[PDB]
């Protein structure tokens, strides 16, 4: 269904719909943030200015970041807006939906990992996994609480979503299989250009301690890519571990080269 505990969009709900088929006045477009729920567009008000064209190679299957004017919770008609849109840029909701496709797809087998998909007991599948985040206040809350889950190695088996199978055969591999987590590896450049004949040994000395501080606390691999330049590529999985790799590198470059009186750039 959807990973939203709420069924329907609300008033002025900026929603991401799916352009299935173009119809007479417009297109019966179906939401995907909320399950599959149909909405409508033009005749009335979607466009703002007049240039009189709609498509050149744009075939089918588009998604429209549109704002709910009218919603019929009983009858089933969701009137949508883009003429009102000065600030509701399409990039933010789709990239949220690019997450929220995977945020849903993580939380809809589940059904200890095969995965299947489809189907388990669909509503009870989400109260245990998908809507229990949406129950977990607030809505900016489970923007991070779900992100706490698919930051998988930071950590895996912590705070609840201890529901329901146990969950944990999914929570190890199927989170990594459904999300396929991406993509950050932070390069960390240290260019130490000493020009005399004294402080250039301190470049090598802070490289010597740069190995040692990468050996003691074990950050990864302070390298030499050039005689002035010490560049490491810090893989980051905890969203804060790359700074601890970098700041222990900068502490060596700042102080050990100052001991033998050289200059640096970092």
């Amino acid at each position: 269904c959807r990973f939203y505990q709420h069924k329907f969009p609300e008033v002025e709900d900026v929603v991401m719909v799916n352009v299935r088929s173009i119809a007479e006045m417009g297109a019966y477009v179906s939401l995907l943030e909320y399950n599959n729920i149909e909405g409508m567009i033009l005749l009335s008000e979607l466009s703002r200015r007049r240039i009189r064209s709609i498509n050149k190679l744009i075939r089918i299957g588009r998604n429209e970041c549109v704002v709910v004017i009218r919603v019929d919770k009983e009858k089933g008609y969701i009137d949508l807006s883009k003429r009102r849109v000065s600030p509701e840029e399409a990039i933010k909701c789709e990239d949220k939906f690019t997450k929220s496709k995977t945020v849903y797809s993580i939380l809809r087998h589940v059904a200890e990992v095969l995965e299947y998909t489809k189907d388990e007991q669909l509503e009870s599948l989400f109260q245990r996994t998908a809507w229990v985040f949406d129950d977990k206040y607030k809505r900016p809350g489970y923007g991070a609480y779900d992100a706490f889950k698919h930051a998988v190695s930071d950590p895996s088996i912590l705070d609840s979503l201890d529901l329901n199978e146990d969950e944990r055969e999914v929570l190890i591999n199927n989170i990594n299989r459904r999300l396929t987590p991406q993509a950050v590896k932070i390069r960390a450049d240290i260019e130490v250009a000493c020009y005399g004949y004294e402080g250039i040994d301190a470049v090598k000395e802070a490289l010597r301690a740069g190995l040692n501080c990468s050996t003691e606390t074990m950050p990864i691999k302070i390298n030499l890519i050039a005689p002035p330049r010490y560049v490491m590529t810090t893989t980051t999985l905890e969203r804060t571990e790359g700074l601890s790799v970098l700041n222990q590198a900068m502490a060596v470059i700042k102080e050990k080269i100052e001991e033998k009186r050289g200059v640096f750039n970092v």
């Binding site: 250039i200 040994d201 090598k204 190995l211 302070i222 005689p227 002035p228």
Partner: protein
């Protein structure tokens, strides 16, 4: 190791690759590789093991025949002898001096540490050729006369056009020792007469009288860094200070300085400098390890200076004497000099611009090639035979052998004469 240093010196459009590999077999290479437009403008190194088969050729390590690869038109077949585990006569070293008119100064620095020269003449350009007037008279001042005039590009140039040039270049170096220099017509296409030329680089060029027991006077003209990009932390090394030693045998583990050195911190005037002392890590012999650096040869002297002190060729013209070296460090300099009546190093078919040069004026920068060093300085008080120049860097005269003074009459400084250190 090495006992001699022969300069492969020659003017524009004669080819350097087919002739230096014919006499050595080891190619002179540096950056921009992307190699070279016409002839090698860098001060490159070349080292080889010349020998004989009771036959005055320099044979290849496959010493049955010498079938070179300088052309595919005719198969160059000389007979250097036969196999049979050849007898090693000596070890030959080369100093590849630059041969363009723009790089006359770095030519003078690398040739000031060598022991011998070759004059590599193209038959292409004008028969009163300027660099043959330039180089030979410059060789005359740097206490060298070991010259082999080697007319290098006469393969398309006919025997009567080649006839005019070596006569007319010798007609202008008539005040220079080049008459004891044999004029050898060879082929840069058929690699021809190298069995006769490598006789002459043994015959005309023997082992010079070289100070073995003296203090080590290395003068580096080429910097080399074994601390290349891609190195590591536990791969810590020094910087290779590779130049020709003109005096004194040098050993591995010797604490060597660069005696002209670097300006010290907060020099409000001109007179404060410190040599950079360094222990020598290794000594190179053409492919081979040694503990000795027998001078009169281009010797790779790997020292314990820092990676930045060799990451570029920053030691061009530096007296690297040992720890506690005697020769002084001058940043202001009293020179005695003579001005040559021909502006030497530039002459065309209309004889431009070798006319008489206006005298040196004070507060004017002039390149001084002191010993083998590459520095520039302005003259403070200029007389007829009393020059008082102040240098931007404290430079060391290895000995008061010679200086080469040039005046900026064009885009590059051009040779107006020579002189000596008072």
């Amino acid at each position: 190791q090495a006992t001699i240093n022969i300069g492969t010196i020659g003017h524009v459009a004669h080819g350097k690759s087919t002739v230096v590999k014919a006499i050595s077999g080891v190619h002179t290479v540096r950056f921009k590789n992307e190699l070279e437009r016409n002839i090698t403008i860098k001060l490159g190194y070349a080292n080889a093991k010349i020998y004989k088969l009771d036959d005055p050729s320099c044979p290849r390590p496959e010493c049955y025949r010498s079938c070179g690869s300088s052309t595919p038109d005719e198969f160059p077949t000389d007979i250097p002898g036969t196999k049979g585990n050849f007898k090693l006569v000596r070890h030959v070293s080369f100093v590849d001096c630059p041969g363009h008119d723009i790089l006359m100064a770095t030519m003078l620095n690398g040739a000031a540490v060598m022991d011998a020269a070759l004059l590599l003449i193209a038959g292409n350009e004008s028969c009163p050729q300027p660099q043959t007037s330039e180089h030979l008279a410059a060789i005359e001042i740097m206490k060298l006369k070991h010259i082999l005039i080697l007319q290098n590009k006469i393969d398309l140039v006919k025997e009567s056009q080649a006839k005019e040039q070596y006569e007319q270049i010798l007609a202008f170096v008539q005040g220079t020792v080049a008459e004891g220099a044999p004029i050898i017509p060879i082929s840069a296409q058929l690699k021809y007469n190298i069995e006769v030329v490598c006789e002459y680089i043994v015959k005309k060029i023997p082992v010079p009288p070289r100070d073995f027991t003296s203090e080590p006077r290395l003068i580096v003209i080429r910097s080399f860094d074994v601390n290349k990009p891609g190195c590591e932390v536990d791969d810590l090394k020094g910087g290779v200070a590779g130049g020709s030693i003109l005096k004194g045998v040098l050993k591995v583990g010797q604490e060597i300085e660069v005696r002209p050195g670097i300006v010290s911190k907060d020099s409000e005037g001109k007179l404060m400098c410190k040599p950079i002392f360094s222990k020598i890590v290794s000594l190179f012999a053409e492919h081979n390890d040694l503990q000795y650096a027998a001078p009169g040869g281009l010797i790779g002297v790997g020292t314990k200076i820092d990676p930045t002190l060799c990451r570029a060729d920053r030691m061009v013209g530096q007296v690297l004497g040992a720890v506690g070296a005697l020769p002084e460090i001058f940043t202001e300099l009293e020179i005695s000099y003579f001005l040559l009546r021909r502006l030497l190093g530039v002459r065309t078919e209309g004889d431009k611009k070798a006319a008489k040069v206006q005298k040196l004026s004070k507060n004017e920068v002039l390149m001084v090639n002191i010993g083998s060093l590459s520095t520039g300085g302005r003259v403070s008080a200029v007389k007829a035979d009393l020059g008082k120049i102040v240098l931007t860097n404290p430079v060391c005269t290895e000995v008061g052998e010679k200086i080469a003074l040039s005046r900026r009459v064009e885009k590059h400084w051009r040779l107006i004469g020579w002189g000596q250190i008072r």
